[PDB]
Amino acid sequence: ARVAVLISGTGSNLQALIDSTREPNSSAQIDIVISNKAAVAGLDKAERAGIPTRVINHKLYKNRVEFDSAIDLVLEEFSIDIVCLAGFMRILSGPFVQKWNGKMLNIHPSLLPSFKGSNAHEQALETGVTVTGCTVHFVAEDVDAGQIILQEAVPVKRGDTVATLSERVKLAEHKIFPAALQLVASGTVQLGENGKICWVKEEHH
Ligand SMILES: CS[C@@H](CCCc1c(N)nc(N)[nH]c1=O)c1ccc(C(=O)N[C@@H](CCC(=O)O)C(=O)O)cc1
Numbered sequence: 312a313r314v315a316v317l318i319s320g321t322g323s324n325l326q327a328l329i330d331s332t333r334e335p336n337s338s339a340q341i342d343i344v345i346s347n348k349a350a351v352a353g354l355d356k357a358e359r360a361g362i363p364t365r366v367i368n369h370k371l372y373k374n375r376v377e378f379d380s381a382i383d384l385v386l387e388e389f390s391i392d393i394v395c396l397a398g399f400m401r402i403l404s405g406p407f408v409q410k411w412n413g414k415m416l417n418i419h420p421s422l423l424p425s426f427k428g429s430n431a432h433e434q435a436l437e438t439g440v441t442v443t444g445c446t447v448h449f450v451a452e453d454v455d456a457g458q459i460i461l462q463e464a465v466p467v468k469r470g471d472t473v474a475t476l477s478e479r480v481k482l483a484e485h486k487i488f489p490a491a492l493q494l495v496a497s498g499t500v501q502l503g504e505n506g507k508i509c510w511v512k513e514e515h516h
Pocket residue numbers: 396399400401402403404408417428429450451452453454455456
C-alpha cells in the first residue's frame with residue numbers, strides 16, 4: 312500500500328512510520344509527505360529520507376473544500392492508498408473525510424474517549440488518572456471520533472510532569488502508529504460497510 316502523511320509542523324511519529332516501512336515484511340511504503348506549511352521540520356525529515364514532499368497553502372484557496380480538493384489531487388497524482396495524519400492542524404472537510412473513509416488514520420495521546428482535544432497529557436495529570444495511553448483511529452468528520460484501531464495503556468508515574476508523561480506516551484505512539492499502519496496497509500484491519508472495525512483473514516498465505 313502506498314501511504315501519504317499529512318503534516319503541519321514537526322511530523323511527530325513520521326520517522327517511526329518511515330522506519331517501520333523499511334522492515335522486511337512491510338505492507339506499506341511512505342510515498343509522499345504533504346504539509347500545509349512551508350519549511351517545517353517534518354518536511355526536512357521526509358526529504359532527508361528521500362521521500363517526496365509537497366506544500367499546499369490553504370491561503371491560496373477560496374475555502375476549505377477547495378484547499379482539501381487540492382490535497383486530494385496530489386494524493387490522486389501519487390496513487391496513494393492510505394493517509395496518516397501526523398500533526399495536521401487543519402480540519403478536513405466532510406467530502407474529503409468521506410472519500411478517504413477507512414483509509415485515513417490518526418493518533419491521539421490518550422485512551423479515547425478520555426481527554427479529547429488538545430493538551431491531553433496535562434488533562435491526564437490534572438485529572439489524576441493512574442493510567443493513560445494513546446489511540447490510533449480512523450479519521451472522522453468530528454475531531455477525536457472515528458473507529459479505534461489500536462490502543463496502548465501507559466502508566467502515569469508519581470512525580471510525572473507534562474514532559475516526562477509526554478515522553479512515555481510518545482514511546483508508545485512510536486510503537487502503535489506503525490503497527491496500526493501495518494494492519495491497515497496489509498488489509499488485516501479494514502473498516503466494515505457497517506462502520507465498525509473488521510479483522511480480516513487474508514486469502515493470500
Ligand atoms: C488538536 S489536534 C487536530 C486533530 C484533527 C484531525 C482531524 C482533521 N484534521 N480533520 C477532521 N475532519 N477530523 C479530524 O479528526 C486538530 C487540528 C485542527 C483543529 C482546528 O480547529 N484547526 C483550525 C485552524 C488551526 C490552525 O491551522 O491554526 C481550522 O482548521 O480552522 C482542531 C484539532
